[PDB]
Design a protein around this nucleic acid. Structure first.
Lengths: 124, 82, 92
DNA sequence: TCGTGCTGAGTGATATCTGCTTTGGGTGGGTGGGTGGGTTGAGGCAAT
DNA sequence: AGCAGATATCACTCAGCACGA
């Protein structure tokens, strides 16, 4: 498995994606509001507009803090960036603002009981 | 005929006792049970009888086990001694 | 070339084991004169079966019993433990 | 007649290596079948 | 890659004897 040296650093791109999600504005940030809606079970699909990414890159370049070209990286290889964006969204998911019936979901109960079992095992 | 009728009745009683272990619905109905031990740990069993009864649940728990302790029997062929 | 799991004296004497039985076995078990004899037998077997399962999942109940028998016959530490128990109770 | 090893070869058992074959498609055949699939186009034949 | 058959090396049970009690 010989290695190659490609001019892409996924850590910097992940930082770029997180900054774009947190700070981008077009009120509060558009994508922060979208994630808040998703948390309350109001939205089940998030769409990333490449126009917003291009505008954010242009603004960053204008401010003098030139950043990596995220639009081209997304276009050239989009499969990895889906997972990258999913991870970025997960790391910055806001807490729900509308109470929901957690106990109704099977997954919630199963994970809670797995946590209880893990705590019991650790206490041993 | 009298003995045959008596034996048929005996088999009928045995089958009636066996019936309680059979599910009314088909096998693929897919009922899952969770049973709580005295300590807060849950074990999983499958079958309608498990949900409706506890002794059946423990019997199934026992029965499901794979490991068997070896039993050695000292058998002597009668033909050996003639 | 894999060590087998055995019901060793070590196991028996652990916190989950004989001490567990002594600590909480009268509370859970109850023989009732108003209940059928089969029910009382099933209750006792239920308690001991759950304890056994907790202790030593590999074996069945009857198998467990047999194993217990052999262990108790063989092990000298277990013998000591038992004697200790009996002695301490006789002193009360 | 209990307890504790030492001996022991027998009776296992279960953790562990050695060889197909397959998809489907003629780069396995028609002495494996056509009721296990493929399969639309041309061609010859009988009833019409 | 997965599956079915097989080899061989892994333990465990009943077997029985010496000491002493």
């Amino acid at each position: 498995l010989p290695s190659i040296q490609l001019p892409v650093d996924y850590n910097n791109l992940f930082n770029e994606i997180t900054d774009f999600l947190v700070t981008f504005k077009q009120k509060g940030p558009k994508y922060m509001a979208m994630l808040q809606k998703v948390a309350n079970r109001e939205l089940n699909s998030v769409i990333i507009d490449l126009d917003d990414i291009l505008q954010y890159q242009n603004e960053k370049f204008l401010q003098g803090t030139q950043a990596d070209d995220l639009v081209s990286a997304i276009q050239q290889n989009a499969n990895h960036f889906t997972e990258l964006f999913c991870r970025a969204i997960d790391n910055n998911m806001p807490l729900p603002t509308k109470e929901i019936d957690y106990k109704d979901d099977v997954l919630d109960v199963i994970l809670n009981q797995r946590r209880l079992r893990n705590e019991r095992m650790l206490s041993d | 005929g009298f003995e045959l009728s008596k034996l048929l009745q005996k088999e009928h009683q045995m089958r009636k006792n066996v019936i309680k272990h059979t599910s009314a619905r088909h096998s693929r109905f897919g009922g899952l049970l969770s049973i709580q031990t005295p300590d807060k740990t849950r074990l999983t069993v499958s079958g309608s009888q498990a949900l409706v009864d506890e002794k059946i649940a423990l019997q199934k728990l026992d029965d499901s086990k794979k490991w068997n302790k070896r039993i050695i029997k000292k058998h002597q062929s009668v033909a050996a001694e003639g | 070339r894999r060590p087998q799991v055995k019901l060793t004296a070590e196991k028996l004497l652990s916190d989950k084991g004989l001490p567990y039985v002594l600590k909480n076995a009268h509370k859970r078990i109850r023989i009732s004169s108003k209940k059928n004899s089969y029910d009382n037998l099933s209750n006792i077997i239920q308690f001991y079966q759950l304890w056994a399962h907790e202790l030593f999942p590999k074996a069945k109940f009857k198998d467990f019993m047999k194993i217990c028998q052999t262990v108790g016959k063989t092990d000298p530490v277990l013998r000591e433990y038992r004697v200790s128990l009996f002695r301490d109770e006789m002193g009360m």
